[PDB]
Point group: C5
């Protein structure tokens, strides 16, 4: 079991760490059908998504996707500094797999 | 996959973007039978709804509908600026499909 | 679709609008068996309940009842001004069907 | 139906009202097998639990028990004054049935 | 029934009390398949996890695991002081069983 986000992200061939060290600039969410997703941005121009759930996810992933959307919303509204994101960089915009917050 | 609210909105028929750049003026919610909805207003007189779940929603949007009302409530209570709403403009009040918050 | 709490409330028998224009004075909640409810009071003496879920309710109201107790708790804790309540006046205390909040 | 926590408590055997008029001094929660509970304390030395779900609880209480833990946590973190607790006094620590907040 | 976290922790083997008396330095959360977990750190170098849910957790702990991650996120965002953690010291990093928070 990894002990930080960088070592977690290393376990997935399909991933990359972004180091932001900045609050979320905008939060977007959608209830439109097949686009039940969130999108966040940073002042540096980075855009990331929390993906729509699909067959790419086992049951535990579904719950954690909902959690991540909860986390990004409150992080936005509290101006919490996001340290790093672990993202899938094959998806466009890059999909969030993990988040670290420190400040 | 859309990278922003406007791209997302532009995916659907009978939608438009409202650019509010303002906090929500009022928040209403009902648990009355057949009217399990929310209504928000802005100072400019704009009124929007999160629709009652009916036939026009696939069962997967049900969770996103619940999340949207949670988002609107906490946005209202934190006085968070709403940047844009993507709405079905053929409903009265116009029906919320997506939201972005910035600044 | 109604555009406001007053018009929504008018769609049901045995309801009326109370116009409080005030913060909730007290918030009570119970997990006791057959009393799984919330009660709020206002400085003016008004007492209102969120009713225990039951036969009088329909399936789509279940989630909305829970949402309403969520809303009253966080309204209480943020000292949010309650504009209006739509309530059933054939219950004691009168039973909340909808709420609006405005600055 | 009761109109306040004192009348509510009187409906049950083995209960009594604790009048605290004070914030929660500490909040503990456990995910440990068979001790999935919350414990709260007050500065005066009072200690109270939200019981582990069990055969003393009917199905309608399950969501209420989870709600009460949500309530205690947020009350703790907001330093919200707890007026009264309705508790079962045939358990150690006494087991919360109902909470009233006012300040 | 335990009245505090220390007496609670003693009911289990391979569990130990860590007294932090400090706020959470960093909060990490992941939705990656098979790593649906939270990691928290403290300034003193201590690292703790909420475990990915698994065959080692009984049914009554599944809800409590999701709650704990909720509790840790909100604790991090409010800079709440963690008094003690009860953890399984046979996991790497050590896995949270319970938390106490006090002023
Ligand atoms: C090459 C790489 O490692 N990643 C790129 C990413 O660039 C990275 O992130 C940006 C913000 C900056 O820190 C770069 O130095 C860094 O390599 C690209 O990001 C785009 O950057 C431009 C710069 O102004 C715009 O801001 C653009 O909107 C950014 O793309 C968005 O954000 C990304 C994280 C992706 O999710 C992308 O799909 C978004 O449109 C992108 C460009 O495709 O490609 C890698 O992510
Ligand atoms: C309380 C009231 O009567 N408000 C109207 C407002 O209509 C409300 O809000 C709109 C968005 C819609 O959801 C209505 O069903 C609801 O009553 C009017 O806004 C216009 O409404 C029409 C037809 O719905 C179009 O939506 C039009 O785009 C709206 O005007 C735009 O939004 C306004 C708030 C202004 O920013 C205006 O400049 C925009 O063009 C307004 C018309 O001013 O009248 C009341 O506020
Ligand atoms: C009227 C009377 O004699 N009450 C006691 C009560 O103590 C009183 O109330 C408590 C909260 C505290 O302020 C006491 O100082 C006060 O005298 C007993 O509560 C325990 O009291 C001792 C101190 O005497 C400790 O403070 C202890 O933590 C208290 O018990 C805990 O909290 C209680 C509310 C119960 O949930 C109990 O199970 C916990 O262990 C109680 C309990 O024996 O007995 C009378 O009510
Ligand atoms: C990032 C890093 O290298 N941290 C170590 C820290 O270990 C981490 O945190 C502990 C709680 C545990 O979850 C580890 O699995 C995790 O990597 C070290 O902490 C000690 O770790 C061992 C187990 O490896 C025991 O848990 C031991 O009790 C821990 O020491 C206590 O906590 C420390 C932070 C100090 O307060 C120490 O005085 C305590 O005894 C520490 C020390 O080895 O070093 C890094 O911080
Ligand atoms: C216009 C009128 O006569 N209305 C009464 C209610 O009395 C009015 O509203 C109260 C909230 C007070 O502001 C009162 O001064 C005002 O005239 C009456 O409510 C009760 O009033 C008594 C005091 O006389 C207490 O305040 C009591 O708590 C009130 O009742 C509770 O709150 C209500 C809104 C309902 O939910 C009741 O079920 C509660 O018990 C009501 C009920 O007697 O009757 C109207 O006709
Ligand atoms: Ca700011
Ligand atoms: Ca801070
Ligand atoms: Ca203001
Ligand atoms: Ca701000
Ligand atoms: Ca005040
Ligand atoms: Ca305000
Ligand atoms: Ca204080
Ligand atoms: Ca206050
Ligand atoms: Ca600080
Ligand atoms: Ca404090």
């Amino acid at each position: 079991t990894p002990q930080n986000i960088t070592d977690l992200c290393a376990e997935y061939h399909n991933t990359q760490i972004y180091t932001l060290n900045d609050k979320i600039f905008s939060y977007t969410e959608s209830l439109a059908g097949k686009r039940e997703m969130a999108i966040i941005t940073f002042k540096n121009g980075a855009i990331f998504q929390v993906e729509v759930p699909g067959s790419q996810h086992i049951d535990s992933q579904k719950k954690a996707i909902e959690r991540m959307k909860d986390t990004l919303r409150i992080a936005y509204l509290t101006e919490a500094k996001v340290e790093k994101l672990c993202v899938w960089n094959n998806k466009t915009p890059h999909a969030i797999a993990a988040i670290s917050m420190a400040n």
